[PDB]
Structure formats: C-alpha cells, structure tokens
Amino acid sequence: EGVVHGVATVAEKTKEQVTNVGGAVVTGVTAVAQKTVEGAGSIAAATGFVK
Amino acid sequence: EGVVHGVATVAEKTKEQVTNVGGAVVTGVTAVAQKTVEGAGSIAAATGFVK
Amino acid sequence: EGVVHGVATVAEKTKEQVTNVGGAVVTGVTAVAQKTVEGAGSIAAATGFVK
Amino acid sequence: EGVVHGVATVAEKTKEQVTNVGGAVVTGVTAVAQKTVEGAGSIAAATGFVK
Amino acid sequence: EGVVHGVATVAEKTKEQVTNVGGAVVTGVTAVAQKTVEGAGSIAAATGFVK
Amino acid sequence: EGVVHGVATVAEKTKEQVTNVGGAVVTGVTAVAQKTVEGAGSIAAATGFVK
Amino acid sequence: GGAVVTGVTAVAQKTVEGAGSIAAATGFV
Amino acid sequence: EQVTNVGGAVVTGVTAVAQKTVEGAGSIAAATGFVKKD
Amino acid sequence: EQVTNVGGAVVTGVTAVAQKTVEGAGSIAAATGFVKKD
Amino acid sequence: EQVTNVGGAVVTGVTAVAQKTVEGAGSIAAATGFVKKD
Amino acid sequence: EQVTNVGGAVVTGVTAVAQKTVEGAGSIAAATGFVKKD
Amino acid sequence: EQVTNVGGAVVTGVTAVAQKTVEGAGSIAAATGFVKKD
C-alpha cells in the first residue's frame, strides 16, 4: 500500500568521509516534522518568530 | 500503491568526501516537513516572521 | 499496508568516518516530530519564538 | 498493517568510526516526539520561547 | 498489526567505535517523547522557555 | 497486535567501542517520556523553564 | 598546499518549515 | 580511490556557526575580533 | 579506498558551534577575541 | 577501506559546543578570548 | 577495514559541551580565555 | 575490522561536560581560563 499521505525516503550510507579540522559541522539522516488530519478537525500553527 | 499524496525519495550515498578546514558546513539526507488533509478540515498556519 | 499518514524512512550505515579535531560536530539518525488527528478535534500549536 | 498514523524508521549500523579530540560530539539513533488525537479531543502546545 | 498511532524504530549496531580524548560525547538509542489521546480528552503542554 | 498508541523500538548491540580519557561520555538505550489518556480525562503539563 | 586564512567569520544554517536570521561581522586590523 | 591531502591548514582566527532546524525557529549572530599589530 | 591526510592542521583561535533542533526553537550567538601583538 | 591520517592536529585555543533538542527549546551563547603577544 | 591515525593531537586550551534534550528545555553558555605570551 | 590509533593525544587544559534530559529541564554553564606565559 506504500505511503498514502506521508512521504517515503530510503538511503544507504555506503562510504562517507568527513574531516572536521577547522570549524564545526552538523549532519543528519532524515529528520521529519508532520501535521496531518483525516476528517473534520483543525490544525492551527504559528512556527517561527511570532512576537 | 506507491505514494498517494506524499512524495518518495531514494538516495544511495556510495562515496563522498567533505573537507572542513576554513569554516563550517551543514548538510543532511533529505529532511522533510509536511501538512496534508483528506476531507473537510483546516490547516491554518503562518511560518516565518510574524510580529 | 505500509504507512498511511506517517512517513517511512530506511537507512543503512555501511561505512562512515567522521574525525572531529578542529571543532564540534552533531549528527543523528532520523529524529521525528509528529502531530496528527483522526476525527473531529483540534491540535493548536505555536512553536518557536512567541514573546 | 505497518504503521497507520505514526512514522516508520529502520537503520542498520554496519561500520562507523567517530574520533573526537578537539571538541564535542553528540549523536543518536532516532529520538521521537509525538502528539496525536483520535476523536473529540484537543492538544494545545506552545513549545519554544514563549515569554 | 504493527503500530497504529505510535512510531516504529529498528536499529542494529554491528560495529561502531567512538574514541573521545579531548572533549565530551553524548549518544543514545531512541529516546522517545509522546502525548496521545483517544476520545473525549485534552492535553495542554507548554515546553521550553515560558517565563 | 503490536502497539496501539505506544511506540516500538528494537536494537541489537553486536560490537561497539567507547574510549574516553579527557572528557565525559553518556550512553543510553530507549529512554521514555509518555503521557496518554484514552477515555474521559485530561493532562496539563508545563515542563522546562517556567519562572 | 598552503591553506592560510587571515581571519574568518563563517555561518551556515539549514531550516525547513520555520525561520532563521543570520547576522555576522568581522573585525580585522 | 578518493584521496585528500591538506598541506598547511593554517587558519588564524575563526568563528564558525552551524545549525539545522526543522519545525521551529533559530537565529544566530556571530562576530570576530582580530588585531595583529606587529 | 578513501583516504584523508591532514598535513599541518594548525588553527590558532576558534569558536565553533553546531546544533540541531526539531519541533522547538534555538538561538546561538558566538564571538571571538583574538589579538596577536608581536 | 577508509583511512584517516592527521599529521599535526594543533588547535591552540578553542571553544566548541553541540546540542540536539527534540520537542523543546535550547539557546546557547559562547565566546573566546585569545591574546598571543609573542 | 577502516583505520584512524592521529599523529599530533594537540589542543592546548579548550572547553566543550554537548547535550541532548527530549521533551524539555536546556540552555548552555560557555566561554574561554587564553593568553600565551611567550 | 576497524582499529583506533592515537599517536600524540595531548590536551593541556580542558573542561568538558555532557548531559541528556528526558521529560524535564537542564541547563549548565561552564568556562575555562588558561594562561601559558612561558
């Protein structure tokens, strides 16, 4: 049935070289954030700088 | 059935070298953020700078 | 049945070298955030800087 | 039946090396954050800087 | 039946080496955060900096 | 039947090496934070910095 | 070969579904 | 066969900031002060 | 067969920072003070 | 068959910091003070 | 067959902090002061 | 078959900390000052 409303991601990390010798690095494998609804309902959101 | 509303992604990371010497870098494998709806409903969102 | 509303992610870490000498590093495997509803309901959320 | 509303993640750690001499490193396998409702309910959540 | 509302996570640790000599390291396997309701219920959660 | 609302996580540790001489290390497997209500009830939780 | 940098500010960020503001400046004399 | 040889690697005074944010907000502000009088 | 060779690796005065945030907020601010009088 | 060779690895004075936050908030502020008179 | 070879590994004056937070709040503030007169 | 080879491994003055928080709050602040006059 695969994926209906969500998303699908596949990855294979065979060989990677990362040398951190002069700074800072951040890396990641597929972080996700999800807001979904099926029927009657309401998702109200304010994400960011709101003040 | 594959994908109905969301998207699909495949990425095989075979061989990669990144050299961090004169600064900083960020990268990752396909982060995603999703909002979808099936029937009657509402997603009311404001993302960014709102003030 | 796969995934209906959520998302699907697969990753394989075969060989990876990270050498952290000239600074700091952060990395992760698929952290997730999820808010969903099925029927008549309400998720109301404000995430970030609200003031 | 797989997963209905939540998300699905699989990872395999075959071989990974992290050496950290001149800084700090944080890493992890799939931390999760989830809020969900089924029927007549409500989730109200302000996460971040609220003031 | 798999998982209905929660999430699914599988990870295998074949071979990994963390060598940390001149800094601090933190790592872990799948810490989770969850708040869910089924029927007539409510969750109100302010997390972060609230003041 | 798996898990209805809770989450599912499996992990195997074949071989992992940690060495720490001049810093701090913390390692963990499946730390849990959960709150769940099914019928008539509620949960109010403010966690973090409240002042 | 040489890799000699005088003095540097370096900024990198990725944001998905939010907002981010970078503000950097260097002082060299 | 992928190889990298860093010969000198001499960077004197640096500020380096990286961040990743999903579903939120993050603002970063950095500044360097360098003076090589001689 | 991948190989990294770092010859010198000399970085004198540095501040470095990375962070990841999912479903929240995070602001970092850094600054360096360097003076090489000689 | 991957290999790392760090020849010198000399980083005089640094501050470094990383963090991951899921479902919360985290703000950091760092700064270095360096003076190499010579 | 992966191997790490650190030749020099010299970091004179450093401070480093890392944290992970799930469902909470955490703020860190670090600083260094180094003076190598010679 | 992975091996660890640390040749020099010299850290003069350091201060490092790490923490993990699940369902709570945790904030630390640390700093170092080193003076290598010579």
Side-chain angles (χ1 to χ4, degrees), chain A residues 1-46 48-51, chain B residues 1-46 48-51, chain C residues 1-46 48-51, chain D residues 1-46 48-51, chain E residues 1-46 48-51, chain F residues 1-46 48-51, chain G, chain H, chain I, chain J, chain K, chain L:
Chain A
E1 185 68 7
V3 318
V4 181
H5 281 255
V7 301
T9 162
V10 200
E12 317 231 9
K13 278 284 161 176
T14 318
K15 283 188 174 168
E16 191 168 311
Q17 209 97 18
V18 42
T19 175
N20 166 50
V21 77
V25 304
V26 47
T27 202
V29 203
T30 299
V32 68
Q34 183 193 37
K35 22 192 168 208
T36 330
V37 315
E38 278 267 284
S42 84
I43 289 178
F49 289 104
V50 151
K51 184 98 160 180
Chain B
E1 186 76 1
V3 311
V4 185
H5 283 249
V7 286
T9 41
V10 202
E12 324 225 9
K13 275 278 174 167
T14 323
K15 284 206 168 178
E16 201 196 314
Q17 286 227 132
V18 52
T19 166
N20 168 44
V21 283
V25 276
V26 47
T27 183
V29 202
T30 299
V32 75
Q34 142 198 63
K35 30 191 174 215
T36 34
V37 285
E38 282 243 334
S42 79
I43 297 182
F49 287 76
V50 151
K51 213 79 162 194
Chain C
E1 184 72 10
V3 312
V4 169
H5 275 254
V7 308
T9 171
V10 197
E12 310 225 15
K13 283 286 171 173
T14 319
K15 282 186 173 173
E16 180 150 341
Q17 293 257 316
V18 62
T19 168
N20 168 64
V21 49
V25 64
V26 49
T27 182
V29 202
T30 300
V32 317
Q34 185 189 28
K35 21 193 165 207
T36 36
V37 315
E38 279 253 308
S42 92
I43 282 170
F49 273 45
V50 151
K51 180 106 169 185
Chain D
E1 184 76 5
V3 317
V4 167
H5 269 256
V7 307
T9 190
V10 195
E12 306 224 24
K13 284 291 183 176
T14 321
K15 265 162 190 171
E16 199 185 331
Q17 289 245 124
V18 56
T19 194
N20 157 65
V21 307
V25 49
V26 45
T27 194
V29 203
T30 300
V32 320
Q34 191 198 21
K35 23 197 162 211
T36 315
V37 315
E38 272 251 320
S42 92
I43 283 175
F49 279 53
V50 151
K51 187 106 165 186
Chain E
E1 185 72 10
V3 321
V4 177
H5 280 261
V7 306
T9 179
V10 191
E12 298 233 23
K13 284 285 185 185
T14 317
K15 274 176 199 207
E16 186 174 354
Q17 277 216 143
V18 60
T19 161
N20 156 77
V21 4
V25 59
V26 38
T27 190
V29 203
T30 303
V32 302
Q34 200 190 16
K35 35 187 79 148
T36 322
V37 316
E38 275 253 327
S42 89
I43 283 177
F49 290 91
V50 152
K51 181 119 165 187
Chain F
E1 185 73 12
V3 285
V4 179
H5 283 255
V7 301
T9 145
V10 195
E12 310 218 24
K13 286 279 181 188
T14 324
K15 276 167 200 193
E16 190 174 339
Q17 289 248 100
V18 65
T19 203
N20 167 83
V21 315
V25 65
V26 55
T27 46
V29 191
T30 309
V32 193
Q34 194 200 35
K35 32 200 142 197
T36 301
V37 309
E38 320 224 331
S42 204
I43 284 175
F49 276 70
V50 153
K51 180 118 174 193
Chain G
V4 189
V5 176
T6 84
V8 15
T9 188
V11 56
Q13 64 165 8
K14 96 181 188 190
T15 311
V16 41
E17 187 84 311
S21 203
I22 52 185
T26 122
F28 201 101
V29 42
Chain H
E1 178 197 38
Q2 220 156 11
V3 356
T4 179
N5 307 93
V6 185
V10 197
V11 182
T12 71
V14 357
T15 184
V17 58
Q19 71 173 358
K20 111 197 186 189
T21 315
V22 44
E23 184 92 292
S27 198
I28 65 180
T32 116
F34 202 103
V35 45
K36 174 186 165 187
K37 282 202 177 295
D38 190 5
Chain I
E1 187 232 17
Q2 261 171 354
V3 44
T4 183
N5 295 99
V6 192
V10 202
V11 178
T12 83
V14 13
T15 182
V17 51
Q19 66 163 6
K20 101 186 189 184
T21 314
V22 45
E23 185 88 285
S27 186
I28 78 223
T32 90
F34 199 103
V35 42
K36 174 194 166 192
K37 275 202 186 296
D38 191 7
Chain J
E1 204 247 16
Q2 286 173 321
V3 43
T4 75
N5 301 98
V6 191
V10 203
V11 202
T12 79
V14 326
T15 196
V17 50
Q19 65 171 10
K20 71 166 158 166
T21 313
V22 46
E23 183 91 282
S27 186
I28 114 206
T32 88
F34 203 102
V35 41
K36 177 191 171 202
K37 289 200 171 298
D38 194 355
Chain K
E1 196 246 16
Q2 278 173 326
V3 44
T4 168
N5 292 111
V6 194
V10 236
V11 241
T12 81
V14 320
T15 208
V17 47
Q19 61 170 3
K20 76 158 161 175
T21 306
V22 45
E23 182 94 283
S27 188
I28 58 205
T32 70
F34 201 75
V35 43
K36 180 191 172 210
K37 290 195 181 299
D38 188 8
Chain L
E1 191 243 21
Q2 287 168 330
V3 281
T4 169
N5 280 119
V6 198
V10 203
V11 256
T12 83
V14 314
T15 297
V17 80
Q19 51 144 13
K20 63 162 168 180
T21 316
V22 47
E23 182 81 294
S27 177
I28 67 250
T32 184
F34 213 57
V35 45
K36 186 193 175 204
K37 286 193 179 301
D38 186 4

